[PDB]
Design a protein around this ligand. Structure first.
Ligand SMILES: Nc1nc2c(ncn2[C@@H]2O[C@H](COP(=O)(O)OP(=O)(O)OP(=O)(O)O)[C@@H](O)[C@H]2O)c(=O)[nH]1
Ligand SMILES: Nc1nc2c(ncn2[C@@H]2O[C@H](COP(=O)(O)OP(=O)(O)OP(=O)(O)O)[C@@H](O)[C@H]2O)c(=O)[nH]1
Ligand SMILES: [Mg+2]
Ligand SMILES: [Mg+2]
Lengths: 35, 167, 35, 167
């Protein structure tokens, strides 16, 4: 019930984090991943 | 090494086969028990078009009509889109009109778009006529192909055609 | 049961992502965030 | 700008006030409504030790650290650790030994550790006795102080002290 609410908090954390990752160091999202 | 880098996004309903298309093209790998995509990732492959070597930079994310922080960065600088459906679930075809709109709303105006009916190996279970799908693609100014990420059927040619349409 | 599971999938995704972020661009995890 | 960067990590049970100790120190901010920390973040502040300017780089993450992909990179390079408990909660103080064991496992054996009893404003509800914890601290070679992120009580002094012992 509020398991759903933690889920979207997590998802939203991923999205806000990914925005910054995409803008600054997108290479880290490459499959497969080379430093 | 490469002459052009083309960013191409994968789009369409969850479960249609987007990530396995990506893994088929970039790695020649397929996963039957693949789960829904958490987050955003991409993979690359170089092809020949004209004299030229083109790095295809292919982006993948979950198919979700909901707004996300990541949407604008996902379409940003994307020069082509693969809009995919599962030929064995008419619903995923029904939702195509909405993904087109998503591209109208978010992608560049000149984005080359290719409609892709995937899972063509599921021919017992076909729910989506090819001929109809193709009339729809022709009508909406779209490239069109059917594929099987599982077979490899037309997977290379899908990617070849959009990238040649981009070059 | 399945979304105890899904919460954790999300949580592992975050940790794997963060290991890469911490290792290549830790500044993205600064409060505040300067782009 | 600054003569040394000292990385300092915050550890200790969930709910003890780790993220409010961070935002108190670095921004002079408190949130009564703060939720469990998703992920890993940090914030910095510069202070004077001796002649020198010292950037405290203060890391925060949730919870009760089960071994995460995160944990090894979290302690890596930490020269200090604020091991926090809630003075109004005996269990958070009981778990201090587990946290210490984590720094044996994961931090450089040289790390400066400071025991911090947080929420000294809940002096009515006190479940942990100041004197017991100070003896325990000293028994184990830890610094000790009690703080209130809410009141500000001893917060600047906690940080000032661990950095001084580090310096
Ligand atoms: N039979 C068959 N199955 C396929 C094919 N392509 C993908 N699948 C399967 O369909 C399921 C969903 O595939 P995915 O590629 O993970 O789907 P998706 O579009 O990435 O889904 P989202 O992450 O939710 O957006 C998986 O079980 C795949 O193995 C195909 O060409 N033929
Ligand atoms: N009364 C009082 N409440 C505090 C104090 N410090 C923190 N709190 C409150 O206690 C609750 C938990 O605080 P947090 O700072 O989010 O705790 P945390 O240790 O970072 O928790 P996790 O992120 O779950 O690991 C929040 O409602 C805080 O506002 C304090 O010094 N006094
Ligand atoms: Mg996917
Ligand atoms: Mg916290």
């Amino acid at each position: 019930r509020r398991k759903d609410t933690h889920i979207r908090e997590l998802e939203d954390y991923i999205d806000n984090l990914l925005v910054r990752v995409m803008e600054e160091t997108p290479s880290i999202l490459r499959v497969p991943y080379e430093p | 090494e490469y002459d052009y880098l083309f960013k191409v996004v994968l789009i369409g309903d969850s479960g249609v086969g987007k990530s396995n298309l990506l893994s088929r093209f970039t790695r020649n790998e397929f996963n039957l028990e693949s789960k829904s995509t958490i987050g955003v990732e991409f993979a690359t492959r170089s092809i020949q078009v004209d004299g030229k070597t083109i790095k295809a930079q292919i982006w993948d994310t979950a198919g979700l009509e909901r707004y996300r922080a990541i949407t604008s960065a996902y379409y940003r600088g994307a020069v082509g889109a693969l809009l995919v459906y599962d030929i064995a679930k008419h619903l995923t075809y029904e939702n195509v009109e909405r993904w087109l709109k998503e591209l109208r709303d978010h992608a560049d105006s000149n984005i080359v778009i290719m409609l892709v009916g995937n899972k063509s190996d599921l021919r017992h279970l076909r729910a989506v006529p090819t001929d109809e799908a193709r009339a729809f693609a022709e009508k909406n100014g779209l490239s069109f192909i059917e594929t099987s990420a599982l077979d490899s059927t037309n997977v290379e040619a899908a990617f070849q055609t959009i990238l040649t349409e981009i070059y």
